[PDB]
Design an enzyme around this catalytic site. Structure first.
Site, PDB file in Angstrom:
ATOM      1  CE  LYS C 163      -0.857   0.642   4.872  1.00 11.76           C
ATOM      2  NZ  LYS C 163      -0.282  -0.251   5.912  1.00 11.76           N
ATOM      3  CD  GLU C 189      -0.615   1.630  13.002  1.00 15.61           C
ATOM      4  OE1 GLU C 189      -0.420   0.836  12.061  1.00 15.61           O
ATOM      5  OE2 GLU C 189      -1.137   1.283  14.080  1.00 15.61           O
ATOM      6  NE  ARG C 190       3.311  -3.219  14.003  1.00  9.40           N
ATOM      7  CZ  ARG C 190       2.062  -3.200  13.561  1.00  9.40           C
ATOM      8  NH1 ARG C 190       1.619  -2.224  12.790  1.00  9.40           N
ATOM      9  NH2 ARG C 190       1.238  -4.185  13.901  1.00  9.40           N
TER      10      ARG C 190
END
Ligand code: MG
Lengths: 57, 381, 470, 119
Positions: C163, C189-190
């Site tokens: 993506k 997020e990470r």
């Protein structure tokens, strides 16, 4: 051979009838267990909500 | 009871993680010795891989094998045990000492009788001891014996401090507790020094339900999973790894070229076998494919405390992936696996050396030749 | 004038001021302290006002760690909400929630323009009365799931489907054709994936037309729930001042809502269903209503959503799904077979696929393609597998055209030219409608399937098959 | 303590094989419930045939349960248990009725009970 063909079709019909009956009974017992789980989930959720709301006071 | 510890420096338990600018992409491999992990779910230095399962399966065996297999490499290990029997901790320490693994290992323990605060603070102390070596240029590996016990200790502490409960009485910030800890493992950049820290948290499910609260909280933090199942445990698959649901988001980049070239075919054919197994007259190729799958299922399994050097791994994997096993019955497959390696103990040594020194597959023809020779020297049951 | 600290309970602080000098709600306060002895530490903290409790006391949420705070510290009222820099100085740089660069290229001068983080949504009389279609340049999107100016799109997918390549391609195409910029916001997020995306964008070269804001898992709940607003206010400047069409990417909208709940109970609020904050839909609406298409420009947002345990009846996905116009599904099955992008054609949906929006011709072509693919999916599985293969007429041709149409939805991207010599193409929508119609009619039925692979317009396909010996 | 170096090597293999056959039989319960036993392969019917016998031979008669049923009660050492399950797994006793395996101590008692049953 014609007698054999008639016998084959009769046997298949009867076997399918028995299979359908067994599936219906399984559906019944599964529905019972599902209703039990539904009630348990409702009870636990409302208990947690009230326990959280009572903590402020 | 071996006397005091003579240290000079201290570190805070609560520290911030490295930022976006301080890190580098993960490229180096971490070698565990288990063929299933080294092939299907590779793990690289600087990654966080979760091991989730049930009480029956041997997660601690996987951890102890991984710690033992780090003898040749240059890596310090830290084992953190949270809420365990002291007897089991002593057995683990004895197993470690027997294999000479206490030259590079630290053990931090908080047994079940200790007060909840120590069980809540143990992982932070472990990672704080690791970060001392991380920020100098060295590589560290940290194992958390169970995080679902740290969660319970934290919940008890919060309830006793009279803080409002949440879902299943857990406090509101139960995701923060684990994300703040697991984000402290990184692969530093060249300006920072080049060190790293790997993390291997453990999680236990009840009746194999991974849709629960804590398993889903920790699944969405790590870079993949290693799911162990019980129905595959009693079917003969002893590593019990469900390759259908296990994953590795770093995978591919955490391997050597030789294993990159060969692992894709294994993934593809095992996936095809398990996908077309459910509906199993049949097509002439179909049965052959099924047999292939069975052979793979026989070649992935291995015993306990038997680490296999990566060279040999890739070798056998190759010897499988091109159908060379199709001439040997499934029940004999493991025996082949036993006899191939010893055949290389005195033959084809140069091959191994090359695989060790260039991390690339050697001259394929030669490999084939050797395989043929070995097959000439094999007795089919 | 200056307040003092009363309580410190996790990420929530209480401050007491003088009579008649209380700060307004949403204001920002600063603590700047230097240790007076060895029993103290230096403090540099920012707080945001949340509630007025009465008796000259306010309850605030901290934007960082509160370790080292002492009851009796002195707090300064800034006088306005959080303010971030806007303009051309934010292009190609990385910021944090407070609007400070986290790269190492310098500091923004103090004599700049800074916009506040909180503002109301655009009014009814100044919105767009017509639905307009956004031209991306992709072929599967522009045919089976068109995008809308000012709409919201939900992107579904994970690892191994690529993506980030779609993100970069959208940025490049929009910037090149329509002259727009992009803003990326990473919400809880990470950090590893943030570094990966930053270096990919640096390699491609689309960094010079993007602004990046990051607040990730390692940060307190307060910083995770106010980082999407910083990206939003950075993006609104271009719409309202340059009249551009902007893209806004959101790494995980779900985390936003989650962060709110993590402070709700600490602020003294009774819980709602499944332990969520009572003010959930209001917060999501106040966020998502600021991205619209006004009379000057527009902001279109692509948002990635994670569903907890694949339970779509959870309050947070159920609340955010009522703002979406389209969904884009990325499938590993199409990526394995060599279809790029891996967008699923039978699971992607859009509300713009209607004859009154796109047109009658577009709608007919798209529906014909969809039903052909559905027939292929049904037929090829239960039939032609398990030794039940058959060669009925009109079933040879259906699979013939279906295979020739499934491989024409793949495309060659500009951002993939670093690993492959093909320059890449931007295909308008009339051209792909014409090409799909021609394939459907069977005009191009005399060519091999390898010609329909990684190609733009339909005519170029012929040239491919000209060089393949056919 | 179920390790090859603690209990032995024969014991470990016998126990693992018994568990494997019981798990395989457990996997086939739903399809037997709905369809029946007539839609199975020969290997599956063999698996069921041995699994019912194993499941019935895991039972026993206890000394303290004598006042309930009447049987005196039994005691079996390890080696006899391993031997009996090894013989069961080998298809040695595949012809006896499945009911002769219930509530006995050893496998010689299984043979005697089958003999007294008219077979
Ligand atoms: Mg364990």
């Amino acid at each position: 051979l014609l007698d054999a063909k008639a016998s084959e079709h009769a046997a298949r019909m009867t076997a399918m009838k028995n299979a359908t009956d067994n599936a219906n009974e399984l559906i019944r017992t599964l529905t019972l267990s599902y209703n039990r789980a539904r009630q348990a989930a409702i009870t636990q959720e409302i208990t947690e909500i009230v326990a959280g709301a009572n903590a402020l006071q | 009871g071996l006397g005091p510890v003579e240290t000079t420096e201290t570190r805070p338990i609560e520290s911030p993680a490295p930022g976006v600018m301080d890190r580098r992409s993960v490229h180096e491999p971490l070698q565990t010795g288990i063929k299933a992990i080294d092939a299907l779910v590779p793990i690289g230095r600087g990654q966080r891989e979760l091991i989730i399962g049930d009480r029956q399966t041997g997660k601690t065996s996987v951890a102890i094998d991984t710690i033992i297999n780090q003898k040749d490499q240059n890596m310090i290990s830290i084992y953190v045990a949270i809420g365990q029997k002291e007897s089991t901790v002593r057995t683990v320490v004895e197993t470690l000492r027997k294999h000479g693994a206490l030259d590079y290992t630290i053990v931090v323990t908080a047994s079940a009788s200790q007060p909840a605060p120590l069980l809540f603070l143990a992982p932070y102390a472990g990672v704080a001891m690791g970060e001392y070596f991380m920020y100098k240029g060295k590589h560290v590996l940290v194992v958390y014996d169970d995080l679902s016990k740290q969660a319970a200790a934290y919940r008890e502490l919060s309830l006793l401090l009279r803080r409002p409960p949440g879902r299943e009485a857990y406090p509101g910030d139960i995701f923060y507790l684990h994300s703040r800890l697991l984000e402290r493992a990184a692969k530093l950049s060249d300006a920072k020094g080049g060190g790293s820290l790997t993390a291997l948290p453990f999680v236990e499910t009840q009746a194999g339900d991974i849709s629960a609260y804590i398993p889903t909280n920790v699944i969405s933090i790590t870079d993949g999973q290693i799911f162990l199942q019980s129905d595959l445990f009693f079917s003969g698959v002893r590593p019990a790894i469900n390759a259908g649901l296990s994953v590795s988001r770093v995978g591919g980049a955490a391997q050597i070229k030789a294993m990159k070239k060969v692992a894709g075919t294994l993934r593809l054919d095992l996936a095809a076998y398990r996908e077309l197994e459910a509906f199993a007259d049949l097509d002439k190729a179909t049965q052959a494919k099924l047999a292939r799958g069975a052979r793979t299922v026989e070649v992935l399994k291995q015993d306990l405390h038997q680490p296999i050097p990566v060279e040999k791994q890739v070798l056998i994997i190759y010897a499988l992936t091109r159908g060379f096993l199709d001439d040997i019955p499934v029940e004999d497959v493991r025996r082949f696996e036993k006899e191939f390696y010893l055949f290389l103990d005195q033959n084809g040594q140069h091959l191994l050396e090359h695989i060790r020194t260039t991390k690339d597959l050697p001259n394929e023809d030669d490999l084939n030749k050797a395989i043929e020779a070995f097959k000439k020297t094999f007795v089919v049951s | 004038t200056r307040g003092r600290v009363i309580q410190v309970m996790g990420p929530v602080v209480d401050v007491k001021f003088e009579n008649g000098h209380l700060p307004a709600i949403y204001n920002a306060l600063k603590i700047q302290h230097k240790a007076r002895n060895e029993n103290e530490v230096d403090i540099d903290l920012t707080l945001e006002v949340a509630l007025h409790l009465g008796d000259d006391t306010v309850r605030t949420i901290a934007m960082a760690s509160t370790d080292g705070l002492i009851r009796g510290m002195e707090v300064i009222d800034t006088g306005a909400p959080i303010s971030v820099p806007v303009g051309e100085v934010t292009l190609g740089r990385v910021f944090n929630v407070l609007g400070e660069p986290i790269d190492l290229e310098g500091d923004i001068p103090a004599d700049a323009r800074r916009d506040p983080i909180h503002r109301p949504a655009p009014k009814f009389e100044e919105l767009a009365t017509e639905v307009e279609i956004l031209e991306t340049g992709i072929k599967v999107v522009d045919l089976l799931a068109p995008y809308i100016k000012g709409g919201k799109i939900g992107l579904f997918g994970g690892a191994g489907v690529g993506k980030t390549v779609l993100i970069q391609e959208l940025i490049h195409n929009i910037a090149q054709e329509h002259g727009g910029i992009s803003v990326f916001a990473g919400v809880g997020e990470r950090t590893r994936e943030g570094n990966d995306l930053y270096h990919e964008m640096k390699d491609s070269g689309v960094i010079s037309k993007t602004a990046m804001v990051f607040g990730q898992m390692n940060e307190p709940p307060g910083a995770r729930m106010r980082v999407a607003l910083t990206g939003l206010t950075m993006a609104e400047y271009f719409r309202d001042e340059q009249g551009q069409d902007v893209l806004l990417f959101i790494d995980n909208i779900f985390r936003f809502t989650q962060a709110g709940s993590e402070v709700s109970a600490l602020l003294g609020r009774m819980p709602s269903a499944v332990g969520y904050q009572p003010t959930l839909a209001t917060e999501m609406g106040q966020l998502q209503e600021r991205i619209t298409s006004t009379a000057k420009g527009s902001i279109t947002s692509i948002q990635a959503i994670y569903v907890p345990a694949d339970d779509y009846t959870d309050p947070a996905p159920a609340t955010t799904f009522s703002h979406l116009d389209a969904t884009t599904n990325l499938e590993r099955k199409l990526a394995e077979m060599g279809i790029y992008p891996a967008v699923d054609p039978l699971a992607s949906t859009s509300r713009a696929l209607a004859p009154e929006i796109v047109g009658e011709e577009h709608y007919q072509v798209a529906r014909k393609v969809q039903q052909t693919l559905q027939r292929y999916k049904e037929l090829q599985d239960i039939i032609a597998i398990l030794g039940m293969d058959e060669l009925s007429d009109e079933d040879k041709l259906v699979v013939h055209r279906a295979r020739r149409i499934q491989f024409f939805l793949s495309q060659n991207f500009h951002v993939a030219e670093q690993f492959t010599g093909q320059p890449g193409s931007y295909v308008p929508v009339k051209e792909t409608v014409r090409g799909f119609k021609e394939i459907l009619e069977g005009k191009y039925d005399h060519l091999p399937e390898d010609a329909f692979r990684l190609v733009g317009r339909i005519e170029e396909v012929v040239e491919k098959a000209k060089a393949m010996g056919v």
